């Protein structure tokens, strides 16, 4: 889910606006992704892309039309830690864990100015 993935990175990074700061960064952070990741932040987004790829080949996710972005799920942010809820059914619980690992990865890697809006001739 986009707005829930947005909310989870703000849980870990209270000062950012993820849809401005982390959209269109490198080769993978954003819509699609291809080529070799340019740094570790970008490698966080490759893994996140691969994890939503996993979820699509899940039998459980198949009947879900509003796919890995508009479909939702439920989680909570409490003292800057993300908890995915047990009332999530199988597809949404896999999506919530994909998104939860991406937001922790984001908070743990250096952010490189030079890669924001990287020319996709580099990917």
State the residues that interact with Ca ion by CB under 5 A. 28, 33, 49
Query: Min. distance of Cβ 23 from Ca ion in angstroms?
Result: 10
Query: Min. distance of Cβ 80 from Ca ion in angstroms?
Result: 25
Tell the residue number behind the tokens 């992704």, with chain if given. 33
Query: Min. distance of Cβ 49 from Ca ion in angstroms?
Result: 4
In the complex with Ca ion, the residue whose CB is nearer, 17 or 81, is 17
In the complex with Ca ion, the residue whose CB is nearer, 49 or 92, is 49
| C-alpha torsion 9→13→15→20, nearest 10 | -40
In the complex with Ca ion, the residue whose CB is nearer, 47 or 74, is 47
From the list 102, 97, 116, the residue with the least C-alpha distance to 58 is 97
Query: To which H or E segment does residue 83 belong?
Result: strand 81-84
């Amino acid at each position: 889910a986009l707005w829930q993935f947005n909310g989870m990175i703000k849980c870990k990074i209270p000062s950012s606006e993820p849809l401005l700061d982390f959209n269109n960064y490198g080769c993978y952070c954003g819509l699609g992704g291809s080529g070799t990741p340019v740094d570790d932040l970008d490698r966080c987004c490759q893994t996140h892309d691969n994890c939503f790829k996993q979820a699509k080949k899940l039998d459980s996710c198949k009947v879900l039309v509003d796919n890995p972005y508009t479909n939702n799920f439920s989680y909570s942010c409490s003292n800057n830690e993300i908890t995915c809820s047990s009332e999530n059914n199988a597809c949404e619980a896999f999506i919530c864990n994909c998104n939860r690992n991406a937001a922790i990865c984001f908070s743990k890697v250096p952010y490189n100015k030079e890669h924001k809006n990287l020319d996709k001739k580099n990917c």
